[PDB]
């Protein structure tokens with residue numbers, strides 16, 4: 517097995533940025549293989565103390581094999597940087613698509629939820645929890661199919677949290693923002709937040725401040741605009757339960773009558 521280095525690649529257009537990741541299109545020189553190179557700075561990793569998160573991201577994602585999960589092929593590093601070799605997703609993020617269209621119709625939404633649930637069913641069969649499902653981490657393949665990415669926060673259940681929360685609370689369940697013990701049911705809550713955001717255009721507990729967002733999440737304070745149908749309301753309300761053990765199994769999501777009636781892809 518290679519043995520990769522920076523000299524092996526021709527770098528191209530920037531694909532996106534994250535808090536740590538700087539991601540570029542790249543072509544491997546001998547084979548002409550097109551891929552995405554996710555670049556991290558060692559100094560930023562060390563100052564933040566998140567080395568263990570990157571190791572998890574690599575070890576966990578590299579061993580997963582599912583059509584709705586982005587491949588990680590390998591990694592390498594030099595004096596200043598770490599490089600992750602990823603599958604290239606040519607149709608961009610679900611985030612960008614939502615910005616373009618404002619809201620998704622029921623068919624598009626049900627289809628994405630099916631693909632998401634299929635992917636998560638596979639992860640949970642290995643007791644892997646993702647913990648950071650949100651539109652900017654959902655990528656699209658050449659056929660428009662959804663692929664879960666960014667495994668930097670992923671772990672094995674059950675878990676406590678040992679690392680500071682930096683960004684948005686918007687997709688996290690009450691047991692996570694309250695810093696309590698949690699399990700695979702965290703991803704089911706996030707799936708409910710996504711289904712609402714796809715249909716409405718914004719997440720259900722969104723607010724102007726951290727402090728009030730925290731309040732809306734812990735008290736589960738959400739309401740529906742008139743256009744959200746009865747079937748969508750039933751599914752979203754089952755997923756957004758304060759008590760995690762009352763959230764449904766992923767098989768129950770995949771077989772929900774609103775999902776089966778509107779999705780264009782089958783359950784796996």
Ligand SMILES: Nc1ncnc2c1ncn2[C@@H]1O[C@H](COP(=O)(O)OP(=O)(O)O)[C@@H](O)[C@H]1O
Pocket residue numbers: 531532533534535536537538539552554586602603604605606608609652653655665666668
């Ligand atoms: N494999 C890929 N193909 C296409 N675009 C990507 C790929 N990976 C990341 N991106 C873009 O780069 C952004 C940041 O990547 P991500 O892995 O989520 O980094 P971070 O860990 O910093 O959030 C994504 O939200 C997306 O816009």
Ligand SMILES: Oc1ccc(Sc2ccc(O)cc2)cc1
Pocket residue numbers: 561567568570571574575591593598
């Ligand atoms: O500070 C750093 C720098 C590079 C890495 S790469 C890596 C290391 C071990 C491992 O088991 C998997 C991937 C991780 C942390």
Ligand SMILES: [Cl-]
Pocket residue numbers: 606607608
């Ligand atoms: Cl694009």
Ligand SMILES: [Cl-]
Pocket residue numbers: 648681682683684
């Ligand atoms: Cl987070």
Ligand SMILES: [Cl-]
Pocket residue numbers: 736756757758759
């Ligand atoms: Cl509840």
Ligand SMILES: [Mg+2]
Pocket residue numbers: 534652653666
């Ligand atoms: Mg990300």
Ligand SMILES: [Mg+2]
Pocket residue numbers: 534536537666668669
């Ligand atoms: Mg990350």
